[PDB]
Amino acid sequence: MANGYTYEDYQDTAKWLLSHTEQRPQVAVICGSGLGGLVNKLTQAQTFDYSEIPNFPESTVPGHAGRLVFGILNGRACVMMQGRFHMYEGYPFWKVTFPVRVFRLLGVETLVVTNAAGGLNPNFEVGDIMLIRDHINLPGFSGENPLRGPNEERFGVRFPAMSDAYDRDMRQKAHSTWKQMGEQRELQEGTYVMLGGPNFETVAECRLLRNLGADAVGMSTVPEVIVARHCGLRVFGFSLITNKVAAQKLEQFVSLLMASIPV
Amino acid sequence: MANGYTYEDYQDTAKWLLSHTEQRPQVAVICGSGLGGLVNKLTQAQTFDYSEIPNFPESTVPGHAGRLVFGILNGRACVMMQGRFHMYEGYPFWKVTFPVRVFRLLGVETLVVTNAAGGLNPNFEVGDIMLIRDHINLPGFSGENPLRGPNEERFGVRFPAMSDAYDRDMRQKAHSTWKQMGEQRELQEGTYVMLGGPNFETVAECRLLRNLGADAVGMSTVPEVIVARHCGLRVFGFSLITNKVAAQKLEQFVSLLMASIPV
Amino acid sequence: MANGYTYEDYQDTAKWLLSHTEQRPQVAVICGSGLGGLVNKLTQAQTFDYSEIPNFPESTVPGHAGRLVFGILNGRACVMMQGRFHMYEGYPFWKVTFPVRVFRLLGVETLVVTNAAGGLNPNFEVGDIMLIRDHINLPGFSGENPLRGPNEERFGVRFPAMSDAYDRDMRQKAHSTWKQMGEQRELQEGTYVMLGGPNFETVAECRLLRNLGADAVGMSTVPEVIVARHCGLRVFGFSLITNKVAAQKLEQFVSLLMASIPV
Ligand SMILES: [Mg+2]
Ligand SMILES: [Mg+2]
Ligand SMILES: [Mg+2]
Numbered sequence A, B, C: 001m002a003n004g005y006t007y008e009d010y011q012d013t014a015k016w017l018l019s020h021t022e023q024r025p026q027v028a029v030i031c032g033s034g035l036g037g038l039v040n041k042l043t044q045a046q047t048f049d050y051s052e053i054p055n056f057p058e059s060t061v062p063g064h065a066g067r068l069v070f071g072i073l074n075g076r077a078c079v080m081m082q083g084r085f086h087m088y089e090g091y092p093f094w095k096v097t098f099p100v101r102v103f104r105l106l107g108v109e110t111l112v113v114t115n116a117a118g119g120l121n122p123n124f125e126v127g128d129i130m131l132i133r134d135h136i137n138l139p140g141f142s143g144e145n146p147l148r149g150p151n152e153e154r155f156g157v158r159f160p161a162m163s164d165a166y167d168r169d170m171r172q173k174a175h176s177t178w179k180q181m182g183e184q185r186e187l188q189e190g191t192y193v194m195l196g197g198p199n200f201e202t203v204a205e206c207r208l209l210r211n212l213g214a215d216a217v218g219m220s221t222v223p224e225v226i227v228a229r230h231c232g233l234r235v236f237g238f239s240l241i242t243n244k245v246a247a248q249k250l251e252q253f254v255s256l257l258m259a260s261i262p263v
Helices: A007-018 A036-041 A098-106 A168-180 A203-211 A222-230 A247-260 B007-018 B036-041 B098-106 B168-180 B203-211 B222-230 B247-260 C007-018 C036-041 C098-106 C168-180 C203-211 C222-230 C247-260
Strands: A027-031 A043-049 A067-073 A076-082 A110-119 A129-137 A188-194 A216-218 A234-244 B027-031 B043-049 B067-073 B076-082 B110-119 B129-137 B188-194 B216-218 B234-244 C027-031 C043-049 C067-073 C076-082 C110-119 C129-137 C188-194 C216-218 C234-244
Touching (some): A007 A098, A076 A098, A098 A222, A110 A129, A110 A222, A129 A168, A129 A247, A129 C203, A168 A234, A168 A247, A203 B129, A222 A234, A234 A247, B007 B098, B027 B036, B027 B098, B036 B076, B036 B247, B067 B247, B076 B247, B098 B222, B110 B129, B110 B222, B129 B168, B129 B222, B168 B234, B188 B222, B203 C129, B216 B234, B222 B234, B234 B247, C036 C067, C036 C247, C076 C098, C098 C222, C129 C168, C129 C247, C168 C234, C168 C247, C188 C222, C216 C234, C222 C234
Parallel strands (some): A027 A076, B027 B076, B129 B188, B188 B216, C027 C076, C110 C234, C129 C188, C188 C216
Antiparallel strands (some): A067 A076, A110 A216, B067 B076, B110 B216, B129 B234, C043 C067, C067 C076, C129 C234
């Protein structure tokens, strides 16, 4: 589906935000299912319901508060999406990813994505935290892509590379930080595969996905990462393994990682 | 694509049907390609062309009569779709699956799906009947799903499970019944994979599908099963292997199975 | 997505072309990325910008000139698409494939497709030329197909076969011709897989594709081949391996092949 937002639309929203808060975050965090508590660590917090922000889509899924919260996390200025958007809600990817481009226009340089996923790797257990090393974009194979349509050169190039999407340096930082935390369970890492949803997978589908090389499965994140890389944002993320085919722990982990982010 | 039918639309159609026949079926059967003769076993039959039923889509494929027939099959009150709808016809899944929700609103509790499929399992031969044990929804991987869009809580939940889609008890019943039939060829069973169509598969595609764990391939059924499970219908079905990459026999088989359906 | 062009639309465009040139090509060639120089071998050339041809879509990708050139190539009357259309540009397949049906209505009998692709087969090296033996249509698995919607019987059948898409005889001709050329590097051949794009693949995606049996990957061609076969055109093509996950050479090769095309 071709994008319906104009560059000016993104700019209008960014301007509105800049004129409503003194906060100037360099980092943006998208909180997935059951990860909304991450905004509780914020100091000097300022909240905006998605409904009050011009052009913003709305979270219709339970567990997704639908609020944009600016604040200081571990001495770092951040902006968090307390809840996100999903294709299964009826949103084309250009709407699901709208905030990512707005963040770039606010001066954000790093995007942290989080989600709740089903574990396909047999070595994963419920409660595991998997650093996303790579992804498999199934909807993208059929053309469902947030970048579909005329390319906005002011954001990025026509054919963006995706092989280096998840920042290697941050991957290293995450592991070092996990060790400083003294966690008994090792920090997992792997490939996240996105499918449309909303129904849960069949066994045949799960076997298929695992054999495709996927370690975790979900219905989000990938489109946001694609748009982030297209506009030049540094990206890193984690999947909270909510079941085998921790949230508070991940929030703590992300808070410590703020200190490791460059700039 | 987001659903265009409102709950009331389904209700209007169900009401129209209830006011045009005294029949009150507990079972619904969708007859796929070359399986239209199944309506010939019906007693006290009452037919409605899809064109005369408010809100109903139309069968444009040859071999699909495009008629809804109520009647008694093996002493069981049934409603049969003599012909179905397919995505390749240009129908979004919310239109392809419209009748399933109407059946639920008529008081139907069990849905039997049938189709003609190409055999991927090398042990299948033309004329084989494969009980559907599981499915692989390729269109669903890219987001093409009848459940896409706002969830209608009056039908079902936001994230329905699909791993237990094909009723285990009916699976057992089917096998016992097949044995009572004294059939020389064993009743096959496996995973059905759906793809969009309308063109037939290439060899490379067939090898791919088989290696994905699929036993049979077609361009229908899966969306109907997803909608059925979402609204709570018991589901079971069969693929008539029309070629290696029986109709009358399957009709007889389905007639006997009526006695095995609960309620 | 259902086709938006009527049979008459294709006919109008074909009529316009026939009334603007004396050229009556029996062969059509679609020049992919970096293959636009092929029109330089044409004698008695007549060019039409896509923008001046009624109903024609427009090439928005760099390297795609967006011109239709009629001319004589190796004593053979040809019509070449100097640049093509892609789904990632925002075009549904029925627009991407519009020219193919116009060519059929001009009296064209053979379609030669070319593209630039990434090599998945580990035995391929940059600069390799891969004769397309078969394809894997990922978008087609989810229903994204140029044939989706009501079937135009005046073009072809409802369920066209695709297993024999790439003409075997031309495959043989290509190899014989390559040998006459005295090329030191062997002519490769294999399966081309199409995905939507526009972003480049991740490593996980590349491993997946290779394991699916694909030898080369790109974001075009497959839809054109499907439409060509549907309307009865003889089809053959090549992928120029532009990188491992020659243009002038391929142009020379295609020029020699004109003599091998039947009729
Ligand atoms: Mg404040
Ligand atoms: Mg009667
Ligand atoms: Mg001239």
